[model samples]
Target chain A: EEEEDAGLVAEAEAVAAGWMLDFLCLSLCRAFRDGRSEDFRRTRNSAEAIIHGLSSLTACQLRTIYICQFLTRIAAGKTLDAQFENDERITPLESALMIWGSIEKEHDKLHEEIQNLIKIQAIAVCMENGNFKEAEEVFERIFGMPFKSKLLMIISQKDTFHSFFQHFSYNHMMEKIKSYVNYVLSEKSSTFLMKAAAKVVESKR
Target chain B: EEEEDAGLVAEAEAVAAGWMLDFLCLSLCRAFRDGRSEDFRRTRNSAEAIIHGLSSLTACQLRTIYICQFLTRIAAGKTLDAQFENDERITPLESALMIWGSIEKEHDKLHEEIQNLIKIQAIAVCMENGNFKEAEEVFERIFGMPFKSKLLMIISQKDTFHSFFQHFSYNHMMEKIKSYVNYVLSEKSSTFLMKAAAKVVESKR
Candidate 1:
């Protein structure tokens, strides 16, 4: 009787989650129309609420929610930090990292983009935080052994790679490289620059 | 107890539709990437499943799903017929005509594009099928009277209107117009277009 009660409770939460999920979708579709993200931002709770009902939801549902989180944040101000949280605080950017672990289906470009953003951001945040081992692990997880070949292919100009991070501070960093760092945060990185940054972490050995 | 059964069945179907609707969204997002409609076409059943569960969904969801139906058909090979169907055969192109009746919210560029495409396609098809009455209703529904000015401008502009029907060829086809051409030349109706047509033919004579 107790297990049956728990099961019944789970069923109800599941439907509520489904309902809110559609609400989130509507908010998202509207954002594309009105060019505003406030309604979506208000539903920051919808993300929490859906996950609160997490016990009965599908991984796919979580994936959808996380991607929506990612996309909405880009609209509401965005990232794909590997650690996904900061100092154990759960803001939108950091809330759903575990939820975003690879589902490994034949990825569509959207998924590929989502995955790559998380991976790139992870590598970046690690190096930014001086976590060389953490940064190292992400690439290995992404690419196979020695990965230097993979690393170097993307970072052709040694001097160019050498120039950026070594020179300055977010107190402002180097001119060309600092701009790229700012670019990485504000715009997207060329794989050259991102891989170059990851390479900076690699030269840590 | 029977109502409970129906309720459970509706619940079950609603979740299924929610799941499928997201699946359709994913497929639509993918088409923006790989440029293939084959996966989308395969899920014609997904659209069917979604509409079946329509009882529990929002008008927003219906709006999106219908738009998805509209978008997919073009990728499946496209249309936006105002009436939205021919017989009940239910094609991708013909499937969602009535589903597209004006909700009249401010549509996005995307929704606007979908709406515009359907209206133009509707006009072209009406002309193609020899239903001048149908075409007249559509233009009036779109532009109101005298719809002819708007019609002639669009006819001359580059788009489906021009591509679908060339003006001179339309001019050439007035065996359907020769008797009317004589009437206009004889100053019977004395309408602007009729006089204009009479001048062109008389100039040639």
Candidate 2:
């Protein structure tokens, strides 16, 4: 019985991964790059819906990673905002908001804060090493993120909260966050939470 | 400014990792594995308290892991319950309850259940592989953990709940579980939770 249930879980998870979500998000890129922002808008909005529509917890779990991947590329077509704008006349604000909007839950916001400082930590490393300029320039962008997207003070590893905005959505936010805001996704409350998350997330076996 | 806050976080994280909790839990094994079950009883009780006593959330997070490690060995000790009885005459029930007692928070309970089926999955794999004996013997032990320790039904991934548990303590329960009950620590609510956890836990970069 349990195994049967597990099989159902596997089946739902499998459905979540079909070129369904990933491909939609990938196709999202063409709509934007081809001066077809309407299609980009259509594809992105509908794809984001997959997360809410399924109501199958496991499907939601995996699709968000890819869907976030979708939002990330909208802003991260792999260039500086100015560079992409100059070449393709593209803008990232809408996608950036989508990314931000997706990451609204507590730990999601909490981790974004941790990641921001770690960004500062890494930025400082660069500043301390004389490898970069505008260290605080980017810092300002991250420090001032909108109320809905960033939770700077509440850093409890409560382990009790919503899942939709947890990992992938946050990852998407920051990838484009490089375009719209500056933060770290790779690594804190922040460090305390980071350390605990790292302990469990990483494995020996 | 942010750097200072991050430094504080790191400092606190450091305080969390010292021999403080791990050592206490280590002292726990002595109380049980030895005929000094009284000492086992004392060390385990106060040691468990450490998760609650320290107001530091980071310490609580990591301590639980080591403390659970302590509990796991108390039950594990690398032997059958009767085999250990034949030798040092240790019984695992008392410690098993302690293990059960510690894993109270939702995800903690949820994951234990996920781990149980993965245990089942592994057991079934073993049964199919013609390797281990008593496949069902241990399955029953794992599938039937107490209420606080196992939320066999609710697997919503709400991302909302308490801490104090979530991982380490549950690990302890099943190690000794071989002696008292049957279950899996490495893997599922089960599996939906297991798969979601795995996606976030393991990383590419």
Candidate 3:
């Protein structure tokens, strides 16, 4: 009975730690947007402490921490080029690609959320390199997500690419929507995409 | 004699103010990169005061102040959408476009430099809107400039796009060199673009 009780307490503690980490992520994003580097650093430190304190973490928790580390590096203005022994230093985009498959298998609610974060980072890197087609591909993936509104909110909250957001409008979003409509038409299942397109057009009206 | 001396003094003051404004542009760019919003605000305030203090300004001086005002708005997290009485609201990109043709007539050294700055600003906006082909057109015009190297240095100084520089090799410059090579081939002349490309290629090798 004591062993079972101790196990229950541990599980509760892990759940609490996960919530704290999510809160930290939001706080760090806010600090980054406000250009408060010192505050970002402080929040990152607290996040790291909570992340490491969790005794045993699930795959989702691990993935969340990895995403947080990526965000923290960006906030600090540090290069995301990480080096592993016996390998050349890789960029943030490359790092995201390396981890993409593993994280995709987690199959949780946060899966799409984490995927959007990685895709946004990839889009930023691609834009930097003047690779617009590559960025559009990523944006298409983002637009096709099940929880796109949530993804948009996540992006709106962060200072990932202020210039990009300034010009991103419903028109741009509609282009992606149109492409998806074509794709659905080709697949001979146009109902969903058509309804979504109609709904978006109605919202604009 | 007093009137003549006063005129000379005014000329010297205008030149001095021009140099000071140039310095402020560099400082504001640096502050933006460092994410120092408070320092950016202070420097922008000083720029505004100096700009207003000038007794009489040349057309170039007026254009420079307009650019400075745009930069100041960006640093303060204000939108670049501006509307004047009896005029439609204009974006920064639109403002840059409106001024581009007027500034091209000035054949002085500063003319090309200012034109590049305005073009880059326009390109940034186009890229934000996922208008890559439009940006490429502007880049081609920039590449065709006689003072391309000086323009390159100007962009290097500003924090326009850090990731663009990350993977930007001397090789990318060669790609631009090759485009000029194609243009020369089409023109049936090996003189201008060919020689320029050769010179740049040799410098790299």
Cα lDDT of model 3 by residue, B1-205, tens digit: 9566434433433444444454444444444444567656665655664455356767756665655554453332123344422344444444543544443143555444444444545445445455555455545654554545543553445444545433432234224323323432333222222233334444644
Stretches of candidate 3 exceeding 4 Å from the true structure = A1-5, A55-63, A76-88, A97-205, B1-205
The per-model lDDT (C-alpha) reads: 0.42, 0.38, 0.46
- Clashing residue pairs in candidate 1 (N, C-alpha, C atoms within 3 angstroms): A84-A94, A169-A172, A169-A173, B74-B78, B80-B118, B84-B97, B174-B177
Candidate 1 at A186: error in angstroms? Answer: 52
lDDT (tens digit, per residue) of candidate 2 on A73-113: 53443222432233343223323333444653344554455
TM-score to true structure, per model: 0.29, 0.19, 0.25
Candidate 2 per-residue lDDT, tens place, B72-130, comes to 44444323343322324322332333344465334455445544433433233323334
TM-score winner, 1 or 2: 1
| Clash count per candidate | 7, 19, 0
Better of 1 and 3 by lDDT: 3
lDDT (10s digit) by residue, model 3, range A46-152:
66655654667677567666656655543322243444223453444445444544542444544444444455555555555555554555455545545455435
Predictions' DockQ, in order: 0.01, 0.01, 0.01
- How high is the lDDT of residue A60 in model 2? 41
In the range B1-205, model 1's lDDT, one tens digit per residue, is: 9566434433433453454455444334333233445544444444443454356667656555655664454443223333335553333333433444543345455444444454455455555655566566656655443435756455444234464345433333223223322322233224222233334445654
- Superposed by TM-score, candidate 3 places the C-alpha of residue A139 at a distance from the truth, in angstroms, of 21
Native-to-model Cα distance after best TM-score fit, residue A113 in candidate 3, in Å: 16
What DockQ was computed for model 1?
0.01
Q: What order do candidates take by TM-score, descending?
A: 1, 3, 2
